[PDB]
Amino acid sequence: SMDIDPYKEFGATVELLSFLPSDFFPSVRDLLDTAAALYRDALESPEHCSPHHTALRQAILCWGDLMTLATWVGTNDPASRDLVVSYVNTNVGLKFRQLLWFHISCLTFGRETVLEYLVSFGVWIRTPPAARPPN
Amino acid sequence: SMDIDPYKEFGATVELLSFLPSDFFPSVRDLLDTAAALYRDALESPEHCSPHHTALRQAILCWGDLMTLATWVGTNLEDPASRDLVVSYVNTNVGLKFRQLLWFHISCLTFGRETVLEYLVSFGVWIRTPPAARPPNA
Numbered sequence: 001s002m003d004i005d006p007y008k009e010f011g012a013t014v015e016l017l018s019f020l021p022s023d024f025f026p027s028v029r030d031l032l033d034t035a036a037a038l039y040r041d042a043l044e045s046p047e048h049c050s051p052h053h054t055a056l057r058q059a060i061l062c063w064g065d066l067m068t069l070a071t072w073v074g075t076n077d078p079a080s081r082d083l084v085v086s087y088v089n090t091n092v093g094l095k096f097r098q099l100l101w102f103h104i105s106c107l108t109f110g111r112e113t114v115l116e117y118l119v120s121f122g123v124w125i126r127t128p129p130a131a132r133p134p135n
Numbered sequence: 136s137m138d139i140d141p142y143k144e145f146g147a148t149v150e151l152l153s154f155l156p157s158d159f160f161p162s163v164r165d166l167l168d169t170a171a172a173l174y175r176d177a178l179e180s181p182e183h184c185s186p187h188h189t190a191l192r193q194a195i196l197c198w199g200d201l202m203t204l205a206t207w208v209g210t211n212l213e214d215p216a217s218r219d220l221v222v223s224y225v226n227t228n229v230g231l232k233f234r235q236l237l238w239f240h241i242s243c244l245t246f247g248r249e250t251v252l253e254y255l256v257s258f259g260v261w262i263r264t265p266p267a268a269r270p271p272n273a
C-alpha cells in the first residue's frame with residue numbers, strides 16, 4: 001500500500017488527533033449540521049475556497065457513502081444488521097468525528113489555535129481530576 | 136441536507152462523469168497502483184501541492200475505510216452465499232463512484248483538467264454512435 005496521512009498537509013498527524021480522547025469530539029450528526037450551518041454556502045460553491053474546504057467536502061461525501069452501505073446492509077437479522085451499524089459508530093465514527101472536527105475547527109478558529117488548543121487539552125484532561133485546575 | 140458535488144470545484148459534475156460508461160474506467164486496484172507509481176511522493180508530502188492532490192488523498196483514504204468495513208463484514212458473516220452478495224454490492228455501486236473519482240483526479244494531474252474534459256465528451260459521443268457506423272479510434 002501507500003502511507004498517506006489526512007492531517008499531514010495540514011500540519012498535524014493521526015497520532016496527534018488521537019491525543020484528544022474519543023468522548024471530546026461532537027457527534028457526526030452534530031458536526032454535519034454545524035458544517036451546513038456555518039459553511040453550506042462555500043462547501044456547495046464552485047470556488048476552491050481553501051484546502052480545508054476541499055478536504056471537508058470529501059469527508060462529508062465519504063461519510064455519505066459509508067452510511068449508504070450500513071443502510072443497504074440493514075435493508076438486506078435484527079441482532080446482526082443492528083450490530084453492523086453499531087461497528088460503524090464504534091470505529092470509523094471516531095475517525096470521522098476527528099476529521100470533520102479538525103476541519104470545521106480549523107476553518108472556524110484558525111489552524112494554529114486548533115493545534116495549541118489540542119495539546120493543552122490533552123495535557124489538561126490527563127492531569128488527574130484530583131489536582132486538575134478549573135474546567 | 137447538503138448537496139455537494141465532488142467535481143464542482145474542479146469544473147465538472149457528477150452528471151458529466153456519468154456520461155462515460157461504467158466499463159471505461161480502470162479498476163480501483165489499478166487506479167490506486169497508478170496514483171502510487173506516479174504521485175506517491177507528492178501524495179505522501181506535507182505540501183498541499185494542488186487541490187487535486189488534496190482531493191485524491193481523501194479519495195484513497197476513503198476507499199481504505201470502505202474496504203476495512205467490507206472486510207470486517209465478510210469475516211463476520213459466516214455464510215459463503217452472503218459474502219458473495221456483499222462484495223457484489225461494492226463493485227456495483229461504491230466502486231463505480233470511486234473508479235470515476237480516482238480516475239478523474241489522476242488523469243487531471245497527468246494530462247490536464249481541460250484535456251480530460253474535452254476527451255470525456257468526445258468519448259461519450261463516440262461510444263454512443265452505434266458500432267455499425269462508428270469510426271476507429273476515439
Ligand SMILES: CC(C)CN(C(=O)Nc1ccc(F)c(Cl)c1)[C@H](C)c1c[nH]c(=O)c2ccccc12
Nearest residue numbers: 026030031034035101104105108109113114117
Ligand atoms: C465551543 C467550542 C470552542 C468548544 N470546543 C469545541 O471544539 N467544540 C466544537 C468545535 C467545532 C465544531 F464543529 C463543533 Cl460541532 C464543536 C472545544 C472544547 C474548544 C474549547 N476551547 C477553545 O479555546 C477552543 C479553541 C479551538 C478549538 C476548540 C476549542
Ligand SMILES: CC(C)CN(C(=O)Nc1ccc(F)c(Cl)c1)[C@H](C)c1c[nH]c(=O)c2ccccc12
Nearest residue numbers: 161165166169170237238241242246250251254
Ligand atoms: C493512456 C490513457 C490516456 C488512456 N485512457 C485512460 O483514461 N486510461 C487511464 C487514465 C488514468 C488512469 F489512472 C489509468 Cl490507470 C488509466 C483514455 C482511454 C484516454 C485516451 N485518449 C486520450 O486522449 C485521453 C486524454 C485524457 C484522458 C484519458 C484519455
